[PDB]
């Protein structure tokens, strides 16, 4: 049911805004939406109830109660050999594979009588509004009416937004939206690729599919150049990704395994999941990355708690009472570098995201204090 999904996602959000989090927003027709998403999660974090569904799913809210799943992107999936979810997979259970397109995800949602796009985290991001500019284009009037019909029937269409101005690694020639899959808002079930393919209105947009005889396509993908990789579709409908070493080496900081600052940078930037998959063959490198990952996730939880708890208890007091309490919390937690963080909050507290940026940047200034013991 919808409400137990909502309540389980809400549950995930009490832990830490480091981890799973939600954010409210209002569309141009004036109604509220809630997007559930995440910043950093570990393998144990992904085992909690419905955590794999907490990757951009959106509800329209009447205050605290949800009224409908307005949008439903793909479940979280991982690189092969990234963690136990993907480490003892029988490659013979692969049904087929899909070009992995290298842009930003956009998913449909119905707002009023309007069919619109949300990027993974927002209804108002630049990719979101750019994708809407495409949908409103007369040259996509026949795609848009189909997507509009799907959402009133409770299906979300998921595309990669790619463009010269949305460069990640791959250089596309032109700005487009590439339909990757369509999913049912209530069940999480997907319309089959073949069903989408034989709709000749949708087919022009649809990501390319390939057949495989046998798992040598894996190493060919790992060794290819000028591709991100492929998304594998299993006989049971689940997915995993496979990236080329070429993509991962450009998507990670250079020399990431030779330098602890660069490894922490890669982790902070959210690319250590692909790096460690790339180094799954090398148990020293894989477990080193994981140790740095654990260190930083553990620190971020601590730092965030201490900073936000301290700010919300003493916000508004005279500056040196506030300083006294900030002094206490930073010295008391063996984290004196946090004092400046807390005092930066004192004049102004915009988003809780800018707090994470300051914690994150500070961490990279003091990274040597934090290299896990033994490395
Ligand atoms: N054929 C495809 N099928 C599904 N997703 C695709 C496909 N091609 C590109 N993508 C994109 O791949 C994304 C997931 O893989 P990617 O490595 O880009 O994730 P990410 O942005 O690093 O997020 P995370 O690692 O947290 O899952 C999807 O959200 C989607 O935008
Ligand atoms: Mg991507
Ligand atoms: Mg990733």
UniProtKB/Swiss-Prot annotation:
Changing residue 180 to A: Partial loss of the ligation of 5'-PO4 and 3'-OH termini of the RNA strand; no effect on tRNA repair. Its cofactor is Mg(2+). Belongs to the Tequatrovirus RNA ligase 1 family. Keywords: ATP-binding, Evasion of bacteria-mediated translation shutoff by virus, Host-virus interaction, Ligase, Magnesium, Metal-binding, Nucleotide-binding, RNA repair. It catalyses: ATP + (ribonucleotide)n-3'-hydroxyl + 5'-phospho-(ribonucleotide)m = (ribonucleotide)n+m + AMP + diphosphate. Its EC number is 6.5.1.3. The record marks 160, 247 as: Essential for RNA ligase activity. Changing residue 120 to A: Increased adenylyltransferase activity. No effect on ligase activity. It comes from Enterobacteria phage T4 (Bacteriophage T4). NCBIfam families: RNA_lig_T4_1 (TIGR02308). Mg(2+) binds at residue 273. Binds 2 magnesium ions that perform the catalytic activity via a two-metal mechanism. One of the catalytic Mg(2+), which is coordinated by 5 water molecules, engages the lysine nucleophile and the ATP alpha phosphate while the Mg(2+) orients the PPi leaving group. InterPro entries: Rnl1 (IPR012648), T4-Rnl1-like_N (IPR019039), T4_Rnl1_C (IPR049042). GO terms for biological process: RNA repair; virus tail fiber assembly. Pfam families: RNA_lig_T4_1, T4_Rnl1_C. Involved in countering a host defense mechanism which, following viral infection, activates the host anticodon nuclease and shuts off viral translation. Repairs 5'-PO4 and 3'-OH groups in the cleaved host tRNA. The nick ligation reaction entails three nucleotidyl transfer steps. In the first step, the RNA ligase reacts with ATP in the absence of nucleic acid to form a covalent ligase-AMP intermediate and release pyrophosphate. In step 2, the ligase-AMP binds to the nicked duplex nucleic acid and transfers the adenylate to the 5'-PO4 terminus to form an adenylylated nicked intermediate. ATP binds at residues 38, 55, 76, 160, 241, 243. Changing residue 102 to N/S/E: Complete loss of ligase activity. Changing residue 101 to T: About 50% loss of ligase activity. The active site is at 100 (n6-amp-lysine intermediate). This is RNA ligase 1.
């Amino acid at each position: 049911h919808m409400q137990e999904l909502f309540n389980n996602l809400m549950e995930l959000c009490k832990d830490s805004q480091r981890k799973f989090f939600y954010s409210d927003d209002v569309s141009a027709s004036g109604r509220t939406y809630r997007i559930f998403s995440y910043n950093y999660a570990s393998y144990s974090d992904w085992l909690l109830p419905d955590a794999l569904e907490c990757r951009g799913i959106m509800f329209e809210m009447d205050g605290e109660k949800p009224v409908r799943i307005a949008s439903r992107p793909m479940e979280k999936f991982f690189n092969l050999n990234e963690n136990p979810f993907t480490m003892n997979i029988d490659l013979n259970d692969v049904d087929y594979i899909l070009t992995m397109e290298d842009g930003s995800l956009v998913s449909t949602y119905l707002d009023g009588d309007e069919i619109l796009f949300k990027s993974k985290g927002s209804i108002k991001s630049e990719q979101a509004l750019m994708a809407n500019g495409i949908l409103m284009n007369i040259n996509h009037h026949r795609l848009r009416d189909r997507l509009k019909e799907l959402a009133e029937d409770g299906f979300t269409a998921n595309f990669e937004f790619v463009a010269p101005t949305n460069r990640i690694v791959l250089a596309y020639q032109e700005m487009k939206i590439i339909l990757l899959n369509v999913r049912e808002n209530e069940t999480g079930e997907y319309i089959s690729y073949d069903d989408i393919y034989k709709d000749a209105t949708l087919r022009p947009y649809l990501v390319e599919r390939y057949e495989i005889d046998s798992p040598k396509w894996i190493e060919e993908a790992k060794n290819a150049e000028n591709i991100e990789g492929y998304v594998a579709v299993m006989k049971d409908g689940s997915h995993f990704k496979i990236k080329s070493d070429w993509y991962v080496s450009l998507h990670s900081t250079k020399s990431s395994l030779d330098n602890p600052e660069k490894l922490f940078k890669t982790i902070i930037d959210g690319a250590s999941d692909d790096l460690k998959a790339m180094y799954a063959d090398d148990e020293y490198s894989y477990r080193k990355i994981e140790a740095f990952e654990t260190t930083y996730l553990k620190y971020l939880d601590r730092a965030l708690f201490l900073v936000l708890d301290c700010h919300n208890k003493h916000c508004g007091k005279d500056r040196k009472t506030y300083a006294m309490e900030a002094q206490g919390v930073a010295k008391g937690a063996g984290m004196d570098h946090l004092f400046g963080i807390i005092m930066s909050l004192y004049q102004g507290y915009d988003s809780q995201e800018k707090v994470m940026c300051e914690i994150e940047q500070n961490f990279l200034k003091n990274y040597k204090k934090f290299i896990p013991e033994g490395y």
